[PDB]
Design a protein around this ligand. Structure first.
Ligand SMILES: *[P@](=O)(CCCN=[N+]=[N-])OCCCCCCCCCCCCCC
Length: 248
């Protein structure tokens, strides 16, 4: 029900190739742009890929305000279902809330062959901190600045963040965190040492909470939050390809 046009570079991306699929999920207020280089690299290597645009994302923040986390889940379920028609083995990877949605999916779908969450969020104390300051909360908050080490990169993201959406995110994370123990599939967890948006300790929470026997944390020493576009991008791609091949 978006009323604004999809921004250039924020379109969903599909590639139909082999019988192994990768679903790529972008983050909160973010767009497919943050995940596109990964998507193209995986498609080139012969994977069928689906990079959806989350409902209310990549248009305008007014559109986002109307959406709930169930809408964002539905956008990822559509992508999953699209892969399931073309693929017998499926991996899911995501940045930030895209990582949260990756964990969410694996909690609901045991058939998922492996997950690659990247700076995934299950606990962001800054949200409660902003809600408890005593002041009237604006309907729309000025968004946190783009967090990248590479100075020449610009994340495509909303300049304002609806308060309603932030509350929706907090609810999504709370449920996702609570059910981490349902995940048993292999997990490759990337975390930026210097993430100024999602506390790096989230990676430890996820690592300890999931029940997976095959799990690993890989630390990114040359990236901030938006690692998929940052200096460690080629290593993320290389390590993920290794992970997919090992489990495909
Ligand atoms: P990821 O999904 C990447 C999106 C880029 N960051 N943003 N936004 O991050 C998920 C969590 C969103 C950032 C959490 C910080 C929000 C803190 C604001 C709380 C309200 C304070 C205003 C008074």
């Amino acid at each position: 029900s978006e009323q604004y046009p999809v921004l250039s570079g924020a379109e969903p991306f599909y590639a139909e190739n082999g019988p192994v699929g990768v679903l790529l999920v972008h983050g909160f207020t973010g767009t497919p742009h943050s995940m596109r280089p990964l998507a193209e690299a995986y498609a080139k290597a012969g994977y069928t890929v689906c990079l959806p645009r989350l409902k209310g994302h990549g248009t305008h923040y007014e559109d986002m305000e109307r959406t709930t986390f169930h809408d964002w889940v539905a956008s990822v379920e559509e992508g999953y279902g699209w892969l399931k028609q073309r693929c017998q083995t499926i991996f899911v990877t995501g940045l930030s809330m895209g990582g949260t949605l990756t964990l969410y999916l694996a909690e609901h779908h045991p058939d998922i062959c492996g997950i690659v969450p990247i700076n995934a969020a299950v606990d962001i104390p800054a949200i409660a901190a902003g809600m408890t300051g005593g002041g009237e909360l604006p309907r729309y908050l000025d968004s946190i600045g783009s967090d990248l080490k590479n100075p020449d990169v610009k994340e495509l993201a909303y300049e304002k963040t609806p308060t309603a959406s932030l509350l929706q995110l907090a609810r999504l994370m709370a449920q996702t965190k609570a059910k981490l123990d349902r995940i048993v599939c292999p997990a490759l967890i990337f975390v930026s040492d210097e993430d100024h948006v999602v506390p790096p300790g989230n990676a430890d929470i996820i690592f300890q909470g999931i029940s997976s026997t095959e799990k690993e944390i890989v630390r990114l020493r040359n990236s901030y939050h938006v690692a998929t576009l940052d200096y460690d991008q080629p290593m993320i791609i290389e390590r993920s390809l290794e992970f997919f091949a090992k489990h495909a």
